[PDB]
């Protein structure tokens, strides 16, 4: 383990070598304006990550900064890209933790990995931990058919997430998690996540801005009506629109003859294909040839949960 | 290691210096067998397996050789460690005590040598008594799934050492889950008894034996408190007595008096009786750890496989 | 290490001080083989394997060479650690008593050396019998899930060494957990049954020989009322009858005064018929016959009687 | 250790005085040369790998590559060890032997020098042949997690000293527990099957030699009514018939008085067919067939058989 600011060092003597290596294995050029929508998530990230770095004397007492957030929504919207954006546009060390880091063959290794992760995240910096897919890691605690190790990992998170009784020497840690199934969390771990917020499917203006953003650099015509492309994708997710743009951009390759030309007249014709722009008929064919990952009953269930038990 | 009776000496050389320290760590007249109420069968078996081969040893020979094992079983609050302390206090035998924690070591071949040294010292010293508490661990059938290898050799050493010189040992055990015992180990335990919850009359004697000594009022009706429990576990009656004795401190509000005049208020409270209001407000507060399915399972097992 | 016939001595100077001490620590109270009721085929195999090569050592030369192994498998309490003591009693051969606590070996590379020295010493004293008790431990499957790197070496040394005569018994409660090669080297696998309605009458009339019985001559009734007793429980039945002869006279109160003749008055009292009812209504068999049925199934599908 | 052929002497003063004494104790018989009644391919490979390059030494050289290894696998009843003992007592090569015990030591640094001294002795003495019995306990998986650090150096010195005259040979019972790099150095992994209906008849006709037998027994019925027997169970059956000849009479009830006359009358009598019927009635096979199919699958997948 490398050193931190002010030249100190970490005494990891009471742990073995593979635990230290398994934690050290989980340790640019984006921005927060690349995320269309999601105003309240940017608000909580603003008043919990980048404002205490500038004016730390204001956040004291009842205005202590938050140390939890869970982004629970339908599986198409942007829930990992916002975490990568707040990892890129910051100055704090980042810890990505999935469910297959905290797993081992022996007895009593997952709790030591979680303990070492939180101790390094407190020691190194005002850091931030991103636990992706929390529903495979913190489940329920009294269900039938769970092993005797997942319950100890849940108890480790429940004990470690609060704490720090000494009010002096306060170092910052901020836990962030993404979920598709938000009714599958333990209540004592759901309580530890303040600011549980919902991330919705994009509206008309969000889809219009996303089509306007994703079609820069690629040469297009001047006869594309963005209002028809906004109003015809009624029900598309935030990730299907980039798929629609990609199919409309390779439809200009499927329009010409490269399947008939075998070898000859193929690489000599690819040199002049790079200048051909994208007209309306390619978007019509791509809109006919792409269907959304529908079934809005899960969006309805997630929205009703975030409206009953949510905190924004 | 001390020297036993008749001035002999034990030559413990092949064993390491920490096995002998552990067995030495396993090794009064405070109590007596009249303090425990109920349990007639256990007192009878202890009387004709520990006491009577000391007075008349020319009678227990041949077919009438004395017993060599016993295991008690029942609900988890009815008294089966108190009988072990009573027979430790009212005897002249080097009383051992062994739990499931001082048979453990992370080296290969130290969990089955502690047991061998234990039985060799119990033979060497005296007509000893071994008392293994919570024997449901170090039990369990050997054809089980997910059983570690050394916990099989511990049971094998227990199985070899417990049958076979006029040197007497008496292995005594106690458990709450008796159906999870080994198959070839509940054969060696020659007397498997059941100890129930107290009946309608034993609870009155337990109330009297707890509340003797403490100054009480002369109008406490013992019959109503005896018939009003109806399912108490035997330890919950003593807990009821402690709650009804501390309620006379919780009646005078001593939460704000501190330093000044508090130290005389406890002297004024030390001569105050335990009236009927204390027992009513203690009966409204204490409930047993019920769910008598454990008692019914122990009754069915000790009535289908128990040798009283 | 003592000497043998013709005064030779073993050159055990290539072994440590505690290994030879263990093998010497694992190395004649007169019982009789006709003091065991039942098991005719077991006594037949023991006869042909131990007693007859001593009398006529010329009949066993080629194909008729004597047997080299045996396994007694069955329920607990049926008399498996009694025939080993009987054949240790009435023989001139050198006995042995190996177990699983005798091969602890906290160091590395010592348990296989103890096994090798055990067989190399049993082949020194020329008639020898080795009795491995409860070979379930240290006799599991060679490719099991949770095993060390020393238990497999112990099993491999048993497989190598079992290929001047020895004779190896065994005893098991759970015979299906044995190996394949180690099950193969045991040339005789014999089931031990629970006693029938004829053997129990013989067993109670053998066990009650000292204490005076008077009128309970209904031994057919007393052997017909016990349905599934496992052999070692009817001895507890007779013992409970004798202690019930004690229990009828309340001796808890008599303290000090004439405790020598009052128990002499319990030395002339006879075991009446009232005692066996109060001994049958307080003693139950320790098991149900699931392990008995499974042992019978395994010895019918794999037993070479 | 003695000297060798052609007048040389070994200088083993670099190693300690007990490594020589513990590897010397592995280096005049009439063992069965032709009396192995199967496996013509194994006899072909051994006769082309040890004798024909040592009778005419230019018959197998260079591009005509002589062999260097063999890993026999199969069920636990067939004859793997007998071929090693036959090629031991047949040819004129210093037959070594390696167990799992001769490669273990309590000290550190003495578990690797034994293999080096062994291969140096084998390449110094003669065109030797090593028979590492039960190699699935010696060499397991290298880079595991529940493995002590003492076995990796043993397998490393083994693979570094494998390149070497010396013709190594080994036999297993569990072949899939071998290392993935170990099978590359084994130039032949031959499967050894259980004998069919043609081989059991020759097995009975060879194993019933020297014993007076009646001329009514039919070897085809005995060869066809043992569907499932391994190699050893047929020899156990031939033993059980000749012992049933003894147990037909009454020798347990009588003893002492003129028993050698009755024993001479027993030696006079001969084996009928009812003795074979009683022997086949009460002998079961050693193990139910699953490991035979699993080793056939392993030799079909990775082996050259």
């Amino acid at each position: 383990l490398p050193q931190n600011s002010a030249g100190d060092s970490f005494d990891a003597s009471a742990y073995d070598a593979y635990i230290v290596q398994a934690v050290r294995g989980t340790m640019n050029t984006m921005s927060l304006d690349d995320i269309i929508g999601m105003h309240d998530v940017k608000q909580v990230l603003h008043e919990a990550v980048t404002l205490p770095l500038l004016v730390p004397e204001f956040f004291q007492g009842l205005r202590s900064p938050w140390k939890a957030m869970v982004l629970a929504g339908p599986p198409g919207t942007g829930k990992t890209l916002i975490a990568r954006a707040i990892a890129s546009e910051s100055s704090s060390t980042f810890f990505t933790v999935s469910s297959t880091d905290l797993s081992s063959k022996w007895r009593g290794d997952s709790e030591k990995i979680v303990r070492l992760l939180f101790e390094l995240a407190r020691f190194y910096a005002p850091s931030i931990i991103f636990i992706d897919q929390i529903d495979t890691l913190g489940g329920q605690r009294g269900n039938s058919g769970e092993h005797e190790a997942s319950r100890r990992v849940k108890s480790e998170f429940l004990v470690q997430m609060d704490g720090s009784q000494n009010k002096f020497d306060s170092r910052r840690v901020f836990v962030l998690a993404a979920t598709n199934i938000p009714w599958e969390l333990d209540e004592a771990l759901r309580r530890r996540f303040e600011k549980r917020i919902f991330i919705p499917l994009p509206d008309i203006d969000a889809r219009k801005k996303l089509i306007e953003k994703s079609m820069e650099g690629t040469p297009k015509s001047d006869e594309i009506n963005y209002d028809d492309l906004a109003a015809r994708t009624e029900g598309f997710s935030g990730a299907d629109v980039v798929s629609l743009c990609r199919t409309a951009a390779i439809n200009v390759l499927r329009r010409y003859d490269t399947k008939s030309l075998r070898g000859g007249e193929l690489t000599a014709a690819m040199e002049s294909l790079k200048a051909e722009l994208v007209r309306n008929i390619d978007f019509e064919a791509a809109l006919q040839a792409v269907s959304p990952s529908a079934g809005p009953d899960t969006m309805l269930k997630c929205k009703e949960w975030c409206d009953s038990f949510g905190a924004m | 290691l001390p020297q036993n009776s008749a001035g002999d000496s034990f030559d413990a050389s092949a064993y390491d210096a920490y096995i002998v320290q552990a067995v030495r760590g396993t090794m009064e007249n405070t109590m007596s067998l009249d303090d425990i109420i109920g349990m007639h069968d256990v007192k009878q078996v202890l009387h004709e397996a520990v006491t009577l081969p000391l007075l008349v040893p020319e009678f227990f020979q041949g077919l009438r050789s004395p017993w060599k094992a016993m295991v008690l079983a029942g609900p988890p609050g009815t008294g089966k460690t108190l009988i072990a302390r009573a027979i430790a206090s009212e005897s002249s035998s080097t009383f051992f005590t062994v739990s499931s924690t001082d048979l453990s070591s992370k080296w290969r071949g130290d969990s089955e040598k502690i047991v061998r040294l234990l039985f060799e010292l119990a033979r060497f010293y005296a007509p000893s008594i071994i008392f293994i508490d919570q024997i449901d661990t170090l039990g369990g059938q050997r054809g089980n799934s997910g059983e570690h290898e050394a916990s099989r050799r511990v049971k094998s050493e227990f199985l070899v050492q417990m049958d076979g010189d006029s040197r007497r040992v008496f292995v005594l055990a106690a458990t709450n889950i008796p159906w999870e015992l080994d198959e070839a180990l509940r054969r060696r335990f020659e007397k498997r008894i059941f100890i129930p919850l107290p009946d309608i009359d034993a609870r009155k004697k337990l109330i009297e034996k707890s509340m003797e000594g403490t100054p009480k009022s002369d109008e406490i009706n013992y019959d109503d408190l005896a018939a009003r429990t109806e399912g108490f576990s035997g330890a919950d009656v003593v807990s009821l007595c402690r709650t009804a004795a501390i309620n006379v401190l919780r009646r005078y509000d001593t939460k704000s008096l501190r330093g000044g005049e508090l130290t005389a208020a406890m002297e004024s409270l030390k001569a105050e009786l335990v009236r009927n209001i204390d027992f009513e407000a203690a009966l409204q507060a204490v409930s047993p750890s019920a769910g008598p399915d454990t008692m019914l399972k122990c009754k069915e097992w000790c009535d289908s496989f128990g040798a009283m | 290490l003592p000497q043998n016939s013709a005064g030779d001595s073993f050159d055990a100077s290539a072994y440590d001080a505690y290994i030879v001490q263990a093998v010497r620590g694992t190395m004649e109270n007169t019982m009789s083989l006709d003091d065991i009721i039942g098991m005719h085929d077991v006594k037949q195999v023991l006869h042909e394997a131990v007693t007859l090569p001593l009398l006529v050592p010329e009949f066993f030369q080629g194909l008729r060479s004597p047997w080299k192994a045996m396994v007694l498998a069955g329920p607990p309490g049926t008399g498996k650690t009694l025939i080993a003591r009987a054949i240790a009693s009435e023989s001139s051969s050198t006995f042995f008593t190996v177990s699983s606590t005798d091969l602890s070996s906290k160091w590395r590379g010592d348990s296989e050396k103890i096994v090798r020295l055990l067989f190399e010493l049993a082949r020194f004293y020329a008639p020898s019998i080795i009795f491995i008790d409860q070979i379930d431990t240290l006799g599991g499957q060679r490719g099991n899930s949770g095993e060390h790197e020393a238990s497999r070496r112990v099993k491999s040394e048993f497989l190598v060494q079992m290929d001047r005569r020895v004779f190896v018994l065994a005893a098991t409660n759970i015979p299906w957990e044995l190996d394949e090669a180690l099950r193969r080297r045991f040339e005789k696998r014999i089931f031990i049954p629970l006693p029938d309605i004829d053997a129990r009458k013989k067993l109670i009339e053998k066990s009650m020989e000292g204490t005076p019985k008077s009128d309970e001559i209904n031994y057919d009734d007393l052997a017909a009322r016990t349905e599934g007793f496992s052999g070692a429980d009817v001895v507890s039945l007779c013992r409970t009858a004798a202690i019930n002869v004690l229990r009828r006279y309340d001796t808890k109160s008599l303290r000090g005064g004439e405790l020598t003749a009052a128990m002499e008055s319990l030395k002339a009292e006879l075991v009446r018929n009232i005692d066996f009812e109060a001994a049958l209504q307080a003693v139950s068999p320790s098991a149900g016959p699931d392990t008995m049925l499974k042992c019978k199934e395994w010895c019918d599908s794999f037993g070479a009687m | 250790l003695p000297q060798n052929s052609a007048g040389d002497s070994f200088d083993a003063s670099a190693y300690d005085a007990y490594i020589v004494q513990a590897v010397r104790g592995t280096m005049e018989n009439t063992m069965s040369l032709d009396d192995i009644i199967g496996m013509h391919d194994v006899k072909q490979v051994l006769h082309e790998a040890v004798t024909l390059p040592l009778l005419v030494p230019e018959f197998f050289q260079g591009l005509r590559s002589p062999w260097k290894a063999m890993v026999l696998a199969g069920p636990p009843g067939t004859g793997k060890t007998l071929i090693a003992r036959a090629i031991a007592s047949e040819s004129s090569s210093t037959f070594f032997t390696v167990s799992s015990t001769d490669l273990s030591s309590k000290w550190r640094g003495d578990s690797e020098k034994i293999v080096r001294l062994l291969f140096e002795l084998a390449r110094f003495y003669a065109p030797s042949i090593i028979f590492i019995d039960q190699i699935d306990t010696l060499g397991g998986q290298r880079g595991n997690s529940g493995e002590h650090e003492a076995s990796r150096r043993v397998k490393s010195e083994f693979l570094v000293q494998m390149d070497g005259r010396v013709f190594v040979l080994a036999a297993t019972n569990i072949p899939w527990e071998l290392d993935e790099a170990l099978r590359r150095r084994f130039e032949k992994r031959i499967f050894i099957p259980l004998p069919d209906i043609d081989a059991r008849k020759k097995l009975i006709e060879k194993s019933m030699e020297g014993t007076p037998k009646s001329d009514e027994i039919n070897y085809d019925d005995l060869a066809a009514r043992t569907e499932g027997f391994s190699g050893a169970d047929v020899v156990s059956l031939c033993r059980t018939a000749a012992i049933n000849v003894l147990r037909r009479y009454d020798t347990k009830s009588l003893r002492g008085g003129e028993l050698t006359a009755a024993m001479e009358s027993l030696k006079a009598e001969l084996v009928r067919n009812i003795d074979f019927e009683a022997a086949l009635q009460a002998v079961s096979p050693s193990a139910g067939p699953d490991t035979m199919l699993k080793c056939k699958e392993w030799c079909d997948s990775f082996g050259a058989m």
Binding site: H147 | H148 | - | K106, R108, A150
Partner: peptide, 14 residues
């Protein structure tokens, strides 16, 4: 001249 001993682990499974 050093010696070597043998420890015991404990692994789990489902």
């Amino acid at each position: 001249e050093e010696e070597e001993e043998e420890e015991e682990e404990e692994e789990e499974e489902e």
